[PDB]
């Protein structure tokens, strides 16, 4: 029996339970976005704004149900409307991560017919992050 | 008259007002668990999750009565159902504390007829803990 | 496309989106106060009391609407009633910032007919402040 | 005009606006307690428990009116019932401050007919305290 560690084992939603994505694996996810005609977008946050929190609820009456701070991140430029070139998306990932090297950065895509985000995963975490485990150290 | 210190004198429920348990005394408590047919289990927590706190109540209306965070700790493996060997329990204490050397670790036991925890006491505190007193320094 | 930074880019109300005021530009604003017969006043706050916060709302029922802590700063001496000399205002800025070199300091002016503050802008921030950007680093 | 400082200028109720009490002035206050037949008592607190705070109100509905944490301090021994000797009080101040050299310590006195604390003032603050001004630095 192995024990799943509760210490410094924070996750990041879709794909965070898998080995970290190689550049080839990221490119394949971008191909998927383009093949389906979805709108790519990049979002970023400083470490203190990265995970869901409750601080604003201090101002509330009994209305905190499904309210969390830090769900919104900051938009990198605009969503890439009409983009059908995967290389353009990859180039923006480089540009975003270069401008904000200490930020969490996630790649998302939107479906305008359902009007919802249809995909999303982390592409960068700051090198100073100490709150997550490598795959082989998630259980002990 | 001696004065009971309010400073760095945190306790840990059952047996925390006695001298720290020797290995022989721990083994005697394990014998008691086995003699009574109770189910041994180990639980652990990092220092920040060890003592009762109130943080989640920020999300509440007027319903905090008997709500506290950090009552739940993390289960080490599973409760040792059908265990009738004290040495097996002692070996799991060693294994748990080895995997989590900086965690608080407590030994508990369950009664499945009453469906309640029937015993429990701390078996490890992190060496970095500064918030407790020696038995002879509890009063000044 | 340039991206407006969300990191360490705190503002300070009126004139914060312009290049920092030169001594000549500050003098011109003081002239404006005097030309209009308004009442100059200086206010200051330590860094922890400088920006709007919510901490007191822990004590509230559902009445936090338009309540914020840190809107009030500390008055430097008294408002300069009857002041008809711009140099006198400039001298008090020097005096205030000298007494509190590590404080935020703002110059304000009051209109007693409308009974409202009619102007205001920051004249000093502590040299240790790192939560703001110069104009050329506001977008990347 | 002198400006009353808002920074690190915390007070301590009765007598805190006067020059610090000399040993002769403390002895005089003790004579006053004894002359009036009041009951001397010492109380103390670590720095984090010294000033009124709000933390427990996170657990409340709309009932925080005249609730504050840190009004209660810790009793040194017991109130000195039947004490008619000032030297005995002075000896307990020495003993208390010796046992808790890093604590805030206050001398108080009770009237059992009104059933209320009838006097009180600080006799020790920790040497590490940096949140107070000497009398000559309270205004600038």
UniProtKB/Swiss-Prot annotation, chains A, B, C, D:
Location of the protein in the cell: Plastid, Chloroplast
Keywords, alphabetical: Calvin cycle, Carbon dioxide fixation, Chloroplast, Methylation, Photorespiration, Photosynthesis, Plastid, Transit peptide
PTM annotation (N-methylmethionine): residues: 1
Keyword Nucleus listed: no
Biological process, per Gene Ontology: photorespiration; reductive pentose-phosphate cycle
Keyword Metal-binding among UniProt keywords: no
GO MF annotation list: ribulose-bisphosphate carboxylase activity
GO CC annotation: chloroplast
Main location (coarse class): plastid
Known role: RuBisCO catalyzes two reactions: the carboxylation of D-ribulose 1,5-bisphosphate, the primary event in carbon dioxide fixation, as well as the oxidative fragmentation of the pentose substrate. Both reactions occur simultaneously and in competition at the same active site. Although the small subunit is not catalytic it is essential for maximal activity.
Protein family per UniProt: Belongs to the RuBisCO small chain family.
Remaining remarks: The basic functional RuBisCO is composed of a large chain homodimer in a 'head-to-tail' conformation. In form I RuBisCO this homodimer is arranged in a barrel-like tetramer with the small subunits forming a tetrameric 'cap' on each end of the 'barrel'.
Subunit structure, as described in the record: Heterohexadecamer of 8 large and 8 small subunits.
Name of the molecule in the record: Ribulose bisphosphate carboxylase small subunit, chloroplastic 1
């Amino acid at each position: 029996m192995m024990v799943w560690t509760p210490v410094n084992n924070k996750m990041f939603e879709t794909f965070s339970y898998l080995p970290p994505l190689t550049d080839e694996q990221i490119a394949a996810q971008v191909d998927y976005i383009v093949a389906n005609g979805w709108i790519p977008c990049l979002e970023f946050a400083e470490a203190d704004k990265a995970y869901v929190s409750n601080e604003s609820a201090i101002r509330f009456g009994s209305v905190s149900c499904l309210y969390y701070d830090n769900r919104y991140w900051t938009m990198w430029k605009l969503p890439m409307f009409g983009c059908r070139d995967p290389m353009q998306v990859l180039r923006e990932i480089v540009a975003c991560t270069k401008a904000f090297p200490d930020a969490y950065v996630r790649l998302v895509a939107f479906d305008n017919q359902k009007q919802v985000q249809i995909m999303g995963f982390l592409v960068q975490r700051p090198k100073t992050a100490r709150d997550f485990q490598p795959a082989n150290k998630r259980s002990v």
